[PDB]
Write an enzyme that holds these catalytic residues in place. Sequence first.
Site, PDB file in Angstrom:
ATOM      1  N   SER B  96       0.847  -1.183   0.000  1.00 15.35           N
ATOM      2  CA  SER B  96       0.000   0.000   0.000  1.00 15.35           C
ATOM      3  C   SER B  96       0.886   1.239   0.000  1.00 15.35           C
ATOM      4  CB  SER B  96      -0.958   0.004   1.202  1.00 15.35           C
ATOM      5  OG  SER B  96      -1.615   1.256   1.340  1.00 15.35           O
ATOM      6  N   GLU B 277      -2.989 -16.071  -4.011  1.00 11.79           N
ATOM      7  CA  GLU B 277      -3.645 -14.964  -3.324  1.00 11.79           C
ATOM      8  C   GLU B 277      -4.222 -15.487  -2.017  1.00 11.79           C
ATOM      9  OE1 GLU B 277      -6.140 -11.542  -5.245  1.00 11.79           O
ATOM     10  OE2 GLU B 277      -7.621 -13.012  -4.570  1.00 11.79           O
TER      11      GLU B 277
END
Lengths: 144, 425, 242
Positions: B96, B277
Amino acid sequence: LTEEQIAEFKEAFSLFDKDGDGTITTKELGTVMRSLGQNPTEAELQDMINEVDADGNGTIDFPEFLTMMARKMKDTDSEEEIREAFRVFDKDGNGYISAAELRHVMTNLGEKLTDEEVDEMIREADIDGDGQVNYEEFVQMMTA
Amino acid sequence: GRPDHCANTVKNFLRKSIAAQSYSKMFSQGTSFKSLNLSLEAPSGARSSFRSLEHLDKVSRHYISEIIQKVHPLSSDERHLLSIIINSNFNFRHQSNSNLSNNILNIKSFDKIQSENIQTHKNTYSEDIKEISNHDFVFFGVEISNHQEKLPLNKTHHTVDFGANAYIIDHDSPYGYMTLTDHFDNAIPPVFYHEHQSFFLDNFKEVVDEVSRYVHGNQGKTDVPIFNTKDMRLGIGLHLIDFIRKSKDQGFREFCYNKNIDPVSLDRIINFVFQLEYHIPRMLSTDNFKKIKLRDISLEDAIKASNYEEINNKVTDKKMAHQALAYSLGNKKADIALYLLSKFNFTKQDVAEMEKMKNNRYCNLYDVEYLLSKDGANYKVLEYFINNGLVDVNKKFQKVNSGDTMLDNAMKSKDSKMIDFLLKN
Amino acid sequence: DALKLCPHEEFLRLCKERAEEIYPIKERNNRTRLALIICNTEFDHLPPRNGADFDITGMKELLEGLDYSVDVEENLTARDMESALRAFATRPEHKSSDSTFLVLMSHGILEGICGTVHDEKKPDVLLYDTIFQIFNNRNCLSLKDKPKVIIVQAARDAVYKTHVEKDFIAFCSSTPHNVDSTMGSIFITQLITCFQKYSWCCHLEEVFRKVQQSFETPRAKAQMPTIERLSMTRYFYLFPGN
């Protein structure tokens, strides 16, 4: 209590019998157990291997493996045990635990965790928004 | 037997309940699941029971059985690789541009952020949120951990760089789930989009055209394999050996079947063949984490991620504050804009200089009043601009939608608050 | 900077030698070229289109480098789009102009482009036939016998027309909603670059063909841009810098 169509263990076991013998080696036990998502310690592995025929050179058959997995699966905590664990902290006998009581329990007892996490799980226990936590009702709702 | 033990059982139960809520949302509100016979009924009461968790375990068992029947006889090299992956632990990475870590790293899910902002209305639901409904999960890329190379071995997930700051954890979550690709996108791209393509181009051959393939269950395409935390390693290894057997490049086969395979090499292979994932339910808050700054971030990415630290470092002059406020209004980050308006005192000549900004995208394209009126999110800053007399309400736009006034944007967004404000002022 | 300019002597030579084969060019002095860009980014009942601002800015800067004055309209309903196109067609600067560009960017269906307040239960669409009608040789005398270029980017008897809809060209992209970049579109980016590097020597359709060739990769051949409703009978050299 007893196992039911969890004999899919055999599938995992069958992925690890090099020969058609249907026999895995002792050295592989942990690996196969980790294939089922279990994390046995070395002490547990030694105890299981000594229970199985020690004389035979790395010979564990699926009957013995399934017998060990039976105990491994029967040692999971039950619903009534969780209810008792809740009741340990409600000496009022009312059937409810204050949100602040549970918060103090989680902050100053048990494995340490972040305050945001205790906030989230207090929100989960505090359905209505009131200080009460109906632990019996909640655990019965969660257990289908 | 100690009181700590009972508190531990209590908190494990409550964490199980949180995860049950997340998985119930995913399995009941997911349209793609109904076609695959994997759907689940909605919760009868306010909350959902553990039946969502047993349904997760059931679908994990289903996919494990599907891949086990595909290759029930196993060779020696296959089983050796399977043991290597079964015994290897993972690092989980979330990227992020925002500062998610101080003394503690707290990453929240999409749904948690929505519930925290308590916006009055729900905007139109996106396709992913509707087709998969994994939006109450924090997402992670997956790498091998038994290495001593630089910690972010892989920096891209689905060829997307989700941010400069990489937060890495080293422990499995008991209630997370793994997919071999994205839960939304079940296709792996060509080799020219893979980050570590140089290694495979230099050393391997036909796998280059074999690796780009839909990774799906036997039900057909759009059948995304789901594995729980207990069954994930086995499923990864079995799908990997299926692909390796299908491959014709003997070099790749004997590289991934090397008895002394390198952990970083194994991570390269798993990031090549798959794009794993991992999803942890609702929030993720821990003290055991590693934060790596891969690169510097742009001022606009900082405004979008509300990274006050990078903003303060980059915004030091009023000419730079013009860019910052433009990017804040354009990206609908009202709180950042108010922070800038308090830290820097803006005058009408400042807005005039912002109108002349050709470097900035928003201010060169749009009038500033347009930017103030585009969405209700900027109401507050609009209020600030009107109460302080920085802009005149009746000003007619001269750039985009010329001749219109801010009232027209208010009527487009149907926000009655902005309309009343503009009418009375 | 990125836009390569055509040398003036080449401009004179090509205007003299191939005048019967190219559209005439009005002198830079007293020229009022206009271009219009309609773009819908936010929709009431449809997913948002992000990165459109990049495409708007790029198309605006390109059209201005080609010496067009650009009007830009955003977040309009179908009726407001029809009114905006009709007003633009009655703009009288077109009398002092030699060409026009219409860039329309939104979601779309096969029959037309979508407006902001669009839903499957109550549709809000501007039909392509409506666009070609508004600018035909009868309803737009200012642009009669002048090239009319329509760039369309969408996501997801009548013989009268063939006599009045003259000198049109449409370059259409139909890439799905989500396939890519949140900082642009591959069609708009490829168009801008091909214009910047090939407009100085090749006519409009040659530039379109080079865009199409850029889409000839196996991973992009599926979303190849199409040349549609070609009513042109001469070649449009944009002669940048002149």
